[PDB]
């Protein structure tokens, strides 16, 4: 009786019939910034309907030998919708999020996905192979946009930390024999109450296939993955002309 779920916010609604429970990251709901922690003096703007809604990104293809994908937040939403406009005409933003990942398969397939939200995901290089080069990741790798990039060495997450203890972050599983979706609610986590949206990226969302996808020949060999996200309590301040990046 808790396997079904419905999330509505804005003018959008997500329904699921085989769903796990809802994960609130660190047990805190997202909220507007109180006066005791505020430092900016200008009155903030709250669009409160046109930015608090479900936005659907692109769709990846799960093969039999896939590595994994990552999206940087809120770089994924900075060119779409009115949230793409308020983040271009202002200097400061502050918002929570609500991530929902869908991937469905039949009763004859098998596989397991590990979804996880990781804050301050700083990428690294392989340092020129032999380890003597002070290499740096380019701008296309660190901030891919709403497409998202693939992983190269997923055992070390391309940052030197192992996959084996990634579950200390808020996380869920998409096991193909029980459920087909995963959902996390993330509050705003930063050292400063407001920040720029074009030079700072708060967290990264990682989808890594631990158990490989396997099926017998003849079944539907096209397994897609689709990510859907929604800001929660977005505020903005510091108006200035449009600067994209």
């Amino acid at each position: 009786s808790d396997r079904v779920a419905q999330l509505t916010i804005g003018n959008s609604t997500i329904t699921t019939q085989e769903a796990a429970n809802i994960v609130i990251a660190y047990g805190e709901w997202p909220e507007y910034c109180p006066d005791t922690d505020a430092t900016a003096v200008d009155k903030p703007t709250r669009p409160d309907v046109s930015v608090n809604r479900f936005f659907t990104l692109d769709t990846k293809s799960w093969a039999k030998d896939s590595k994994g994908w990552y999206w940087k937040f809120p770089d994924v939403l900075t060119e779409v919708g009115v949230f793409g406009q308020n983040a271009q005409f202002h200097y400061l933003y502050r918002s929570g999020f609500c991530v929902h990942v869908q991937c469905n398969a039949s009763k004859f397939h098998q596989g397991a996905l590990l979804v996880a939200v990781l804050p301050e995901y700083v990428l690294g290089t392989i340092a020129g192979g032999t380890g003597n080069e002070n290499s740096h990741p380019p701008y296309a790798t660190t901030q891919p946009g709403q497409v998202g990039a693939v992983l190269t060495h997923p055992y070390v997450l391309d940052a030197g930390i192992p996959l084996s203890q990634l579950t200390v972050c808020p996380h869920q599983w998409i096991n193909l024999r029980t459920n087909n979706c995963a959902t996390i609610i993330v509050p705003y986590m930063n050292t400063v109450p407001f920040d720029s949206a074009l030079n700072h990226c708060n967290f990264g969302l990682l989808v890594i296939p631990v158990v490989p996808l396997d099926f017998n020949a003849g079944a539907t060999s096209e397994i897609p993955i689709t990510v859907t996200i929604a800001p929660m309590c977005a505020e903005f301040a510091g108006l200035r002309q449009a600067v994209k990046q």
């Binding site: 805190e28 290089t125 380019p138 070390v156």
Partner: protein
């Protein structure tokens, strides 16, 4: 109220636990419907099955304290952060404050994401073979934006505003206390983004991950006299950490470090996390 539209929860609170929790007695159980041994790890919650729900247990009153596992006792130990030598040859060195030069303290501090603390610095200074020679020294802390000394006898050594210590080699080692001095509310060891605006290119690609809320200026020592001292000097700096508050834990690094500013690793020898064995059935 002309518009009916305009008028219009924490999960768990903390508590003190001085000792580890006791174990209560139990018996066998035969029944249907109730099952604590079956869980579902897919929801991201850990299991809540205790010992008494799987086997039968006795009653054990334990008094094991959890004092050593607090974050205050875990971090309040002085560790080496710098080795500074004066063979540089003009009797003075200017060392930029970066506390990520030695891997044993870097691994402990990178376990958390945000940290807020006050430090305590100690300087142990001798010759490069441990030998002792009577000699007068001066340390000077230079905040970011302040002018730096360029010579052994510059005008910056007058220290009209700067904090400074004068200490000899034969003395006990000097000790100071430093407060929390960041413009933000906490230090962070990871910063995903660029510090500046504008276009990011291959010439400015090294800016990625450099947060100015952690750059604290520089540090300068010199021999006091206006002439050339005839001895080689070597300074070692040790830092304790007091009044610790931390946030948002992280996985620990299992690859060896390469530089002080970025998490780059060696891409050829990816070290496996566990030591490998031969067979899965034989330990």
């Amino acid at each position: 109220d002309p518009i009916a539209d305009m008028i219009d929860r924490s999960l768990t609170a903390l508590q003190v636990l001085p000792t580890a929790a006791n174990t209560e007695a139990s018996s066998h159980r035969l029944g249907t419907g109730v099952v604590p041994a079956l869980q579902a790890a897919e929801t991201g919650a850990s299991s809540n099955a205790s010992d008494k729900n799987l086997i039968e247990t006795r009653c054990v009153l334990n008094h094991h304290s959890t004092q050593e596992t607090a974050i205050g006792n875990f971090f309040s130990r002085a560790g080496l952060v710098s080795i500074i030598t004066m063979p540089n040859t003009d009797g003075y060195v200017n060392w930029d404050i970066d506390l990520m030069g030695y891997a044993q303290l870097r691994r402990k501090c990178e376990l958390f994401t945000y940290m807020r603390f006050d430090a305590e610095f100690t300087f142990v200074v001798a010759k490069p073979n441990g030998v002792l020679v009577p000699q007068l020294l001066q340390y000077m802390y230079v905040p970011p934006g302040a002018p730096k000394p360029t010579s052994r006898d510059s005008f910056a050594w007058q220290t009209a505003t700067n904090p400074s210590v004068f200490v000899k080699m034969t003395d006990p080692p000097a000790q100071v206390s430093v407060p929390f001095m960041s413009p933000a509310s906490a230090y962070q060891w990871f910063y995903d983004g660029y510090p500046t605006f504008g276009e990011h290119l291959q010439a400015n690609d090294l800016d990625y991950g450099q947060c100015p809320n952690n750059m604290m200026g520089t540090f300068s020592i010199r021999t006091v006299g206006t002439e050339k001292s005839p001895h080689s000097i070597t300074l070692r700096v040790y830092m304790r950490i007091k009044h610790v508050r931390a946030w948002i834990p992280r996985p620990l690094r299992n690859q060896p470090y390469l530089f002080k500013t970025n998490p780059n690793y060696k891409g050829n020898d990816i070290k496996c996390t566990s030591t490998s064995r031969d067979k899965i059935t034989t330990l």
